[PDB]
Amino acid sequence: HHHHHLVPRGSNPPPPETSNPNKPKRQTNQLQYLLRVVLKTLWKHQFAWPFQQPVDAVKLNLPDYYKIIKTPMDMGTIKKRLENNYYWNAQECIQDFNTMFTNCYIYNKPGDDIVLMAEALEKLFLQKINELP
Ligand SMILES: CCN1C(=O)c2cccc3c(NS(=O)(=O)c4ccccc4)ccc1c23
């Protein structure tokens, strides 16, 4: 038989939502600090670029990524969410950050460049987090 299964093709899931009209939302002073200060200084770090958008498993040759990561999260998502006032409180935002890092530590091994980048960003996340309103 001449059906060799070269289609159908792989793909990336839909990225996380950055808007939801029926979700409860607020601006709080903690959440403004998260956008204005915390997110805007991890974002500038030179180890932040792999985290600035969702994992494109196809362009990046990580075809197991989404077999392994079932709750993906990334700083580009977190940034749009904040820009859209998507969170009800700071806990929800922070919990998105923990997820992004946790995912990184789950998919990869200690010593990997990407783990070094995440740890650097985490260490720093935590510092900026301590000085919250
Ligand atoms: C941060 C999310 N992420 C990974 O967990 C991961 C593992 C392996 C490669 C890459 C990756 N590929 S990359 O070419 O941009 C890159 C590879 C190694 C080190 C730094 C980036 C981007 C984002 C992630 C990974």
PDB file of all heavy atoms in Angstrom, residues 1-8:
ATOM      1  N   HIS A   1       0.848  -1.232   0.000  1.00  0.00           N
ATOM      2  CA  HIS A   1       0.000   0.000   0.000  1.00  0.00           C
ATOM      3  C   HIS A   1       0.873   1.267   0.000  1.00  0.00           C
ATOM      4  O   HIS A   1       1.966   1.280   0.582  1.00  0.00           O
ATOM      5  CB  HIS A   1      -0.954  -0.014   1.205  1.00  0.00           C
ATOM      6  CG  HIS A   1      -2.132   0.902   1.063  1.00  0.00           C
ATOM      7  ND1 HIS A   1      -2.477   1.824   2.027  1.00  0.00           N
ATOM      8  CD2 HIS A   1      -3.046   1.036   0.071  1.00  0.00           C
ATOM      9  CE1 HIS A   1      -3.553   2.486   1.637  1.00  0.00           C
ATOM     10  NE2 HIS A   1      -3.916   2.028   0.453  1.00  0.00           N
ATOM     11  N   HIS A   2       0.375   2.319  -0.655  1.00  0.00           N
ATOM     12  CA  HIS A   2       1.123   3.570  -0.876  1.00  0.00           C
ATOM     13  C   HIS A   2       0.746   4.726   0.077  1.00  0.00           C
ATOM     14  O   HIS A   2       1.129   5.884  -0.153  1.00  0.00           O
ATOM     15  CB  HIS A   2       0.943   4.010  -2.329  1.00  0.00           C
ATOM     16  CG  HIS A   2       1.339   2.966  -3.325  1.00  0.00           C
ATOM     17  ND1 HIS A   2       0.435   2.361  -4.169  1.00  0.00           N
ATOM     18  CD2 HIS A   2       2.541   2.410  -3.604  1.00  0.00           C
ATOM     19  CE1 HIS A   2       1.063   1.483  -4.932  1.00  0.00           C
ATOM     20  NE2 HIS A   2       2.344   1.496  -4.612  1.00  0.00           N
ATOM     21  N   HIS A   3      -0.001   4.409   1.137  1.00  0.00           N
ATOM     22  CA  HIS A   3      -0.246   5.329   2.245  1.00  0.00           C
ATOM     23  C   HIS A   3       0.912   5.121   3.226  1.00  0.00           C
ATOM     24  O   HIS A   3       0.942   4.116   3.944  1.00  0.00           O
ATOM     25  CB  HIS A   3      -1.618   5.017   2.879  1.00  0.00           C
ATOM     26  CG  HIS A   3      -2.113   6.039   3.864  1.00  0.00           C
ATOM     27  ND1 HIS A   3      -1.822   7.386   3.776  1.00  0.00           N
ATOM     28  CD2 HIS A   3      -2.938   5.905   4.933  1.00  0.00           C
ATOM     29  CE1 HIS A   3      -2.420   8.030   4.764  1.00  0.00           C
ATOM     30  NE2 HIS A   3      -3.105   7.155   5.478  1.00  0.00           N
ATOM     31  N   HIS A   4       1.881   6.042   3.211  1.00  0.00           N
ATOM     32  CA  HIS A   4       3.074   5.972   4.081  1.00  0.00           C
ATOM     33  C   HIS A   4       2.989   6.825   5.357  1.00  0.00           C
ATOM     34  O   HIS A   4       3.900   6.749   6.184  1.00  0.00           O
ATOM     35  CB  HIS A   4       4.345   6.353   3.302  1.00  0.00           C
ATOM     36  CG  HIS A   4       4.704   5.388   2.213  1.00  0.00           C
ATOM     37  ND1 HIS A   4       5.600   5.696   1.210  1.00  0.00           N
ATOM     38  CD2 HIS A   4       4.284   4.124   1.966  1.00  0.00           C
ATOM     39  CE1 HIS A   4       5.721   4.664   0.397  1.00  0.00           C
ATOM     40  NE2 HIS A   4       4.930   3.698   0.831  1.00  0.00           N
ATOM     41  N   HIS A   5       1.921   7.623   5.504  1.00  0.00           N
ATOM     42  CA  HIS A   5       1.613   8.443   6.718  1.00  0.00           C
ATOM     43  C   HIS A   5       2.534   9.675   6.951  1.00  0.00           C
ATOM     44  O   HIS A   5       2.851  10.028   8.102  1.00  0.00           O
ATOM     45  CB  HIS A   5       1.503   7.564   7.979  1.00  0.00           C
ATOM     46  CG  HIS A   5       0.744   6.290   7.758  1.00  0.00           C
ATOM     47  ND1 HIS A   5       1.367   5.071   7.594  1.00  0.00           N
ATOM     48  CD2 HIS A   5      -0.584   6.051   7.638  1.00  0.00           C
ATOM     49  CE1 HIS A   5       0.458   4.134   7.396  1.00  0.00           C
ATOM     50  NE2 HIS A   5      -0.735   4.702   7.416  1.00  0.00           N
ATOM     51  N   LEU A   6       2.916  10.323   5.837  1.00  0.00           N
ATOM     52  CA  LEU A   6       3.699  11.580   5.811  1.00  0.00           C
ATOM     53  C   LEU A   6       2.820  12.816   5.994  1.00  0.00           C
ATOM     54  O   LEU A   6       3.325  13.915   6.225  1.00  0.00           O
ATOM     55  CB  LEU A   6       4.466  11.705   4.492  1.00  0.00           C
ATOM     56  CG  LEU A   6       5.590  10.691   4.337  1.00  0.00           C
ATOM     57  CD1 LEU A   6       6.058  10.665   2.889  1.00  0.00           C
ATOM     58  CD2 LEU A   6       6.726  11.003   5.313  1.00  0.00           C
ATOM     59  N   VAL A   7       1.515  12.621   5.814  1.00  0.00           N
ATOM     60  CA  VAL A   7       0.471  13.482   6.387  1.00  0.00           C
ATOM     61  C   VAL A   7      -0.453  12.550   7.224  1.00  0.00           C
ATOM     62  O   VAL A   7      -0.475  11.332   6.974  1.00  0.00           O
ATOM     63  CB  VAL A   7      -0.327  14.270   5.304  1.00  0.00           C
ATOM     64  CG1 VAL A   7       0.414  15.527   4.878  1.00  0.00           C
ATOM     65  CG2 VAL A   7      -0.634  13.407   4.094  1.00  0.00           C
ATOM     66  N   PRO A   8      -1.211  13.068   8.200  1.00  0.00           N
ATOM     67  CA  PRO A   8      -1.331  14.486   8.541  1.00  0.00           C
ATOM     68  C   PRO A   8      -0.167  14.976   9.405  1.00  0.00           C
ATOM     69  O   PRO A   8       0.517  14.164  10.052  1.00  0.00           O
ATOM     70  CB  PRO A   8      -2.649  14.536   9.316  1.00  0.00           C
ATOM     71  CG  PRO A   8      -2.863  13.133   9.816  1.00  0.00           C
ATOM     72  CD  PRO A   8      -1.814  12.231   9.244  1.00  0.00           C
TER      73      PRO A   8
END
